[PDB]
């Protein structure tokens, strides 16, 4: 049972949304890294 919220800021309470309880994700940078690392993984198979 989740609930969806835009924002808050700075609690002492552990289970309480915030800007400090927000995970700093970037979808673009991780996808490029993945796409390039996948290419590296593919090149890793064909040395043996």
């Amino acid at each position: 049972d989740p609930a969806r919220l835009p924002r808050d800021t700075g609690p002492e309470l552990m289970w309480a949304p915030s800007l400090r309880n927000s995970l700093r994700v970037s979808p673009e940078a991780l996808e490029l890294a993945e796409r390039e690392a996948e290419r590296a993984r593919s090149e890793r198979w064909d040395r043996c």
Partner: protein, 290 residues
């Protein structure tokens, strides 16, 4: 300031039965000096019984603890919210009081013959607040559970509704209640329409809840809790109908709003008295109107 109200009108049995109750209260008709006999407590409202109009009459008109009873006059003092008073628990359903507990006044639900003096005079019930809300719940659900088994006897059992409604419990005082085992259908009893109010607001609460939650969610985000508390009800009552006549839905919302406000003011226990120093030795309690 002067505070006495001398009501003019007895004989030896009336002298006795009024002298037993020299510390109880009763409502009046006016805050004036001399009054007639009819203006005394609950005579014109309890003779067909109905809780909502009796509560309206008890909260509307003033209140008065009586002091002395002559052969022909009853010198009594009205209670004003200014100063403090002293009352006694001399009522036929006997509930032991306690210190600094809020005292309420409800119309007499435990029988006309219990709280009266036949010369008429009807005294309202004085009993503390948690016992008041407890016995109010336990007579409301008793009316509902008796009416359903007078409708369909296979729904509930008469002994199953009686082990939890034939007794109240506060602070170890395990009291008992006088329940009408034969209420008679189609109303005509005491608490016969308040249960009829309770069922209508319980019925119309989902139709209000869906319209109200859907009406507020397009008001995008004022807080989290318009959509946070959408998860706590069951999903069956969430997606119920969602198509109805807007005039009929408007009348249903308005009817449930007025029946919610009247029942909410009534479930607030009424003219609340705030006691300070009850003493079970003297059976007295220093109280004031709050």
């Amino acid at each position: 300031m002067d505070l006495k109200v001398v009501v003019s009108l007895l004989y030896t049995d009336e002298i006795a039965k009024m002298q037993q109750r020299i510390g109880c209260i009763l409502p009046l008709a006016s805050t004036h000096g001399t009054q007639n006999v009819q203006g005394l407590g609950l005579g014109q409202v309890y003779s067909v019984p109905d809780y909502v109009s009796m509560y309206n009459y008890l909260s509307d008109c003033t209140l008065a603890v009586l002091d002395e009873v002559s052969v022909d006059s009853l010198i009594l003092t009205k209670i004003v919210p200014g100063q403090t008073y002293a009352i006694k628990n001399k009522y036929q359903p006997f509930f032991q009081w306690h210190g600094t507990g809020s005292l309420s006044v409800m119309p007499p639900v435990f029988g006309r013959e219990h709280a009266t003096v036949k010369l008429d005079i009807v005294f309202p019930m004085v009993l503390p607040t948690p016992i008041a809300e407890e016995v109010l719940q336990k007579i409301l659900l008793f009316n509902v559970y008796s009416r359903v088994v007078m409708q369909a006897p296979g729904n509930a059992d008469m002994l199953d509704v009686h082990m939890h409604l034939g007794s109240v419990s506060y602070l170890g005082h395990h009291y008992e209640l006088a329940l009408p085992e034969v209420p008679g259908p189609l109303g005509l009893a005491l608490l016969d329409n308040l249960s009829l109010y309770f069922c209508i607001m319980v019925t119309l609460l989902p139709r209000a809840s869906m319209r109200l939650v859907r009406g507020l969610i397009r008001h995008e985000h004022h807080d989290l809790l318009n959509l946070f508390q959408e998860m706590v009800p069951d999903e069956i009552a969430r997606i119920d109908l969602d198509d109805l006549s807007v005039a009929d839905d408007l009348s249903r919302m308005r009817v449930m709003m007025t029946y919610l406000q009247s029942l909410a003011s009534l479930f607030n226990l009424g003219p609340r008295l705030a006691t300070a120093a009850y003493s079970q030795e003297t059976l007295t309690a220093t109280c004031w109107l709050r």
